[PDB]
Symmetry: C2
Subunit: 356 residues, 2 copies
C-alpha cells in the first residue's frame, strides 16, 4: 500500500464513500474512529505525553507495539487537553502536569515530534480549538495563529524522514461560526497542502442546528479530493447529518463515556439501562444489533450487572456501543454506495427520534 491514497468510490449529494489506503491498512469511509483503549483508532496525545511519556512509548516500540494494535492510529495534537486539563504565546503553550507537577511546553514542533515518537499514522497539526461563543476579532486572531501553526506543523513533519515517508498529516480549519474566516482558513490550509482536512472548532456546545449551518458552507471550502474529518462529533444523528454535508471521518468520546455511565445506543434512540423498566426486559440491548453482547445477553442481565457494580456490565455496554457505531458507519457506507443514503437518513431519523 501507498503512504496515503484517498479514493471516492460513490457519491450521493454531498455524501461520499470510499477508502483511505495507508501502509498499515485500508480505512473505509465514512469512518468512525474509536478511542484505542474499527479500521483506525485514536491515540490520546495529551494523556500519553504525561503517562508514560512519549519517549517511554518510543522506548517500548511505539504505540502500535505498546497497545498491540497493528492497523492505523490517528493521534491528536495534544493541545486541546492541555487547555481542558498554562501560558499561551506565539511559540506554543507551557503547562504544569497535575500528575507530578513537571513542566511541559507544547508547540507545533514539539507536538509533531511527540506524535512521531508515538508512531501514529495520521498526525494532526497543532492548533487551538477556538472557544464558543467567540467574537469575530477573537475568532480571527485564533484562526490566524492556528494557520501560522499549521505551516510550522507541516515543516516539522516534513523534516522527519520516517514520518514524512510513512505517516500522513491533516490540517485543521478554524474560524468559529464565521463564513469569511472559515474560507480564509480553508485557503491557507490548501496553500500549505495537507493529506486531509479537519473541520475544527465545532464540538463546542453550539447545538446541532448551528453546527449543521456552519458545515453547510464550510465543508465545500475544503479540497473535494481529500478526506474531511469532523473532530469530536458526535451522536448518531450528528454523524448522519454531517455525512450528508460531506464529512468522511469522525471521533467522539460518547460510545465509551455512555458505556461507562449506563447509556446504550440503539436504532430506536439511546436507553438508560439502569432504569427499572429494564429489570425484566429479555430483549437484547438492540434487537437488530449483530454485536456479541446482543447475540448472548439480555437488557435484564446487563441492567443487573451495572446495578450490582460489576465491571462486566460496563464492558458489555461499551462493546455494544462501539459495535453499534461501527454498524451505523457500515449502513451509511452501504447506503451511499447503493444510492439510497437520502432514504436511509430519513428512515434513520424517524426511528431514532421516535424512541420506540
Amino acid at each position: 500500500r501507498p503512504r496515503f491514497s484517498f479514493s471516492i468510490a460513490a457519491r450521493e449529494g454531498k455524501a461520499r464513500t470510499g477508502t483511505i489506503e495507508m501502509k498499515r491498512g485500508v480505512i473505509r469511509t465514512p469512518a468512525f474512529m474509536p478511542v484505542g483503549t474499527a479500521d483506525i483508532i485514536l491515540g490520546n496525545t495529551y494523556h500519553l505525553m504525561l503517562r508514560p511519556g512519549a519517549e517511554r512509548i518510543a522506548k517500548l516500540g511505539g504505540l502500535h507495539s505498546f497497545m498491540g494494535f497493528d492497523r492505523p492510529i490517528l493521534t491528536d495534537s495534544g493541545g486541546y487537553q492541555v487547555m481542558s486539563l498554562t501560558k499561551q504565546s506565539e511559540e506554543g503553550v507551557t503547562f504544569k502536569s497535575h500528575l507530578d507537577g513537571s513542566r511541559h511546553m507544547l508547540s507545533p514542533e514539539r507536538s509533531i515530534e511527540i506524535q512521531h515518537l508515538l508512531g501514529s499514522d495520521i498526525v494532526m497539526a497543532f492548533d487551538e480549538c477556538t472557544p464558543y461563543p467567540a467574537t469575530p476579532s477573537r475568532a480571527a486572531s485564533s484562526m490566524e495563529r492556528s494557520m501560522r501553526w499549521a505551516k510550522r506543523s507541516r515543516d516539522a513533519f516534513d523534516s522527519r524522514k520516517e514520518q514524512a515517508e510513512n505517516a500522513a498529516l491533516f490540517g485543521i480549519q478554524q474560524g468559529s461560526v464565521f463564513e469569511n474566516l472559515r474560507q480564509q482558513s480553508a485557503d491557507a490550509l490548501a496553500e500549505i497542502g495537507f493529506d486531509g482536512y479537519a473541520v475544527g472548532g465545532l464540538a463546542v456546545g453550539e447545538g446541532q442546528d448551528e453546527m449543521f449551518r456552519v458545515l453547510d458552507f464550510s465543508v465545500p471550502m475544503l479540497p473535494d479530493d481529500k478526506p474531511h474529518y469532523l473532530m469530536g462529533v458526535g451522536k448518531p444523528d450528528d454523524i448522519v447529518g454531517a455525512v450528508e454535508r460531506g464529512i468522511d471521518m469522525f471521533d467522539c468520546v460518547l460510545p465509551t463515556r455512555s458505556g461507562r455511565n449506563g447509556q446504550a445506543f440503539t436504532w430506536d434512540g439511546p436507553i438508560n439501562i439502569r432504569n427499572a423498566r429494564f429489570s425484566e426486559d429479555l430483549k437484547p440491548l438492540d434487537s437488530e444489533c449483530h454485536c456479541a453482547v446482543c447475540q448472548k445477553w439480555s437488557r435484564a442481565y446487563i441492567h443487573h450487572l451495572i446495578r450490582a457494580g460489576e465491571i462486566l456490565g460496563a464492558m458489555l455496554m461499551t462493546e455494544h456501543n462501539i459495535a453499534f457505531y461501527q454498524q451505523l458507519m457500515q449502513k451509511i457506507r452501504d447506503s451511499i454506495s447503493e444510492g439510497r443514503f437520502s432514504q436511509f437518513a430519513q428512515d434513520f431519523r424517524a426511528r431514532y427520534f421516535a424512541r420506540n
Copy 2:
C-alpha cells in the same frame, strides 16, 4: 448424563482427580469454581435474593437463562452474607435489606426454595459459618444447630420434585478447629446423606498452618467416595495444600477481587501491576500463561490502563487471574493423574514463594 455421579480416576496420597457428571455437564476435579459474573460457576444467593429477587429470576427463566450460562451452577445458601451484610433463632434468620429496607427471613426451607427458583445444579444446605475463634461450647452449639438445619435442608430439597431429580445437595461440616466436633458433624451429615460434603468454617482468618492442621483430621472423616468442597479457599498455595489433603472443589473471591485491585497471579507469586517497576516491562503478566491476555499484551500496557483508570485494565487482569486459576487446577489434575503431584506441589511452592 445422570443427575449426579462422582468418579475418582486417579489418586496420589490423599489427593484425588476425577469427574462429577451432572445433567448440564461434566466437572473435572479438583475444580475451581469462579464467580459467575470453568466447568461450573458460583451464583451468589444472598445478592440475587435482594436484586433482582429469586422470584424475578425464576420469571426470567432461571439463573442459567438469565446469565447466558448453560453448564452447572453452584449456589450458596445465602446465610453467610446475611450476617456479613438481624435476628437469629432455631427457625432461621430475619434481616432487613439495606437496598430498600424490605424484610426477609431465611431458613433452611426458604434457602432451598430460593436456590430452587434460581435453578442451580448444586445446592448448599443452609448453615452458620461459626466465627473464629470460638470456644468449644459455642462451636458445639453452632455445629449442632447447623446439623439440625442440614436435616431440614435435606427434607426441603427432597420435597421439590424438579430439584430432587435434577440437582444435587451438599452438606457442610462445621465444628471450628475441634477434632471431636468435626467428627460429630461428619457423622451427622453422613447419617442424613448428601451428594457431596463441604468443609465449612475454615475461611475465617485462622492462617494456613491452622487450616491445614484442621484439614489433616477433618477431610478423612467425610465419605471418601463423595466430593469434598473447601468453601472460600483460597490463594494458589492454599489450594495446592488442600488438594494434598483430599479436597476436590474450591471457590474464592480472590481472582476477581485481586483483578479489580491491581494484583495478578503468576507462577512466581502475585504481582502488584500498578507498581512503577512494571511501567516498561514488556513481558506478559506471566511468561507461561496461555490466556488471551498474556498472548497479546504486556505488563507495561496493563499497568498503563489501570493507572489511567481504564475499565479495560481491570477486565484484562481479571481474565488473566481466572485463567491462571484454571491452569493451576489443570496442572493439579494432570499431575495427580500422572502420579507426579507430590513433585508438582514441591516445585510449585519453591517457585511461587521465591517471588522471582
